[PDB]
């Protein structure tokens, strides 16, 4: 169980590294998934050995640029049917007004 | 040999990782050491193996 604060996730990661646990099913809102993945990266917990699975339904929204060359596997799930072009147009129109925030 | 530009470092590091070479003596001004270290981190070559 990840503790109350996120950035205190380091002890868990140390324990997992010592125990040689090479498969994980994270479970949290993608916002906290990003933090735990960054903590993993700075822990050297990110190579072609480990393989993460994210029960979050927004794994696609993460920034993946710093991670994709590492050779790590991150299988997620995505319900938002973005293959249809109509959906893509709607999403783009939505982004056209999200950037006020 | 490192290539001319900094971020060209990646193809070199790919072959390093493929050949299973965990002992490296770098030789460059630290201004390049920082860049090559970031590349090595994004390439995921920063574990307890490499020295
Ligand atoms: C991890 O990803 C790489 C590239 O897709 C793949 O070749 C490998 O089979 C995957 N599994 C492991 C070893 O984690």
Curated annotation (Swiss-Prot), chain B:
It is found in: Cell membrane; Postsynaptic cell membrane. It comes from the Eukaryota. Highest expression is found in the olfactory lobe, piriform cortex, dentate gyrus, hippocampus, granular cell layer of the cerebellum, and in caudate-putamen. Sumoylation mediates kainate receptor-mediated endocytosis and regulates synaptic transmission. Sumoylation is enhanced by PIAS3 and desumoylated by SENP1. Belongs to the glutamate-gated ion channel (TC 1.A.10.1) family. GRIK2 subfamily. The postsynaptic actions of Glu are mediated by a variety of receptors that are named according to their selective agonists. This receptor binds domoate > kainate > quisqualate > glutamate. It does not bind AMPA without coexpression with GRIK5. Ionotropic glutamate receptor that functions as a cation-permeable ligand-gated ion channel, gated by L-glutamate and the glutamatergic agonist kainic acid. L-glutamate acts as an excitatory neurotransmitter at many synapses in the central nervous system. Binding of the excitatory neurotransmitter L-glutamate induces a conformation change, leading to the opening of the cation channel, and thereby converts the chemical signal to an electrical impulse. The receptor then desensitizes rapidly and enters a transient inactive state, characterized by the presence of bound agonist. Independent of its ionotropic glutamate receptor activity, acts as a thermoreceptor conferring sensitivity to cold temperatures. Functions in dorsal root ganglion neurons. Homotetramer and heterotetramer with GRIK5. Tetramers may be formed by the dimerization of dimers. Assembles into a kainate-gated homomeric channel that does not bind AMPA. Can form functional heteromeric receptors with GRIK4 and GRIK5. Can form functional heteromeric receptors with GRIK3. Interacts with DLG4. Interacts with NETO2. Interacts (via C-terminus) with KLHL17 (via kelch repeats); the interaction targets GRIK2 for degradation via ubiquitin-proteasome pathway. This is Glutamate receptor ionotropic, kainate 2. The lineage of its organism: Eukaryota, Metazoa, Chordata, Craniata, Vertebrata. The gene is Grik2. The chain holds residues 203 to 253 of 908 of the full protein.
